[PDB]
Amino acid sequence: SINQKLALVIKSGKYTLGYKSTVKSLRQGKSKLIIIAANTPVLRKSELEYYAMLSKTKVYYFQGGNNELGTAVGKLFRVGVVSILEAGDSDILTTLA
C-alpha cells in the first residue's frame, strides 16, 4: 500500500531522516513531501505543519508511531518525521498527497 511505496522511494530516491535535517531541507525548499509519525508531540507536529504551509509542501500523516515509521523506511532506529525530496520509480508525490 504505502509501505511498499516507501521502500521503493527509500531504495530508488532521495530522502532525509530526523527533525533538524527536515527543517534544514524545508527552509531551502528542497522538501517535496514530509511524513510525520503519530506519536510525535503536538508542538512538534504543529511546528512542522506551519513550516509546510510556508513552503507549500504537502503533508502525509502516518498511521502508527515513530517505531513503525522507523521499520517502514528500512532503518532500525526510530524516526519522527521523514522528508522525501526526490521520488524514485513511484509517484507518491502525485498519488494522494
Partner: protein, 91 residues
C-alpha cells in the same frame, strides 16, 4: 548462566514463605520491576515507583496506571468502552 531453576527474583526470599506465595509474588514482581514502552516518546523507559505511578526516565511524563503493570486488564477495556460510548454522541 541461569543461576536459579524456577524461583528467579523471589529467590531473594529464600526458603521462607511457602511455595505458592513466592510463585504469586514472582508473577507480580516480573511485571513490577519490568521496563515498559512509553506511549509518547516511543522509548522503552517507563519504570514505576509509588504504587500506581509510572514515571518515564526520559520525557518527564508520569502515567497514573495500575499498581504493578502500566494499564491493568480491567482498565484497558474501559477506555474501549469509552470509545464505544463517545461515538454515539455525534453518530
Amino acid at each position: 548462566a541461569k543461576r536459579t531453576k524456577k524461583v528467579g527474583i523471589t529467590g531473594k526470599y529464600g526458603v521462607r514463605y511457602g511455595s505458592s506465595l513466592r510463585r504469586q509474588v514472582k508473577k507480580l514482581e516480573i511485571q513490577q520491576h519490568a521496563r515498559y514502552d512509553c506511549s509518547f516518546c516511543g522509548k522503552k523507559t517507563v519504570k514505576r515507583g509509588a504504587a500506581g505511578i509510572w514515571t518515564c526516565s526520559c520525557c518527564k511524563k508520569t502515567v497514573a496506571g495500575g499498581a504493578y503493570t502500566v494499564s491493568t486488564a480491567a482498565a484497558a477495556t474501559v477506555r474501549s468502552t469509552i470509545r464505544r460510548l463517545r461515538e454515539m454522541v455525534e453518530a
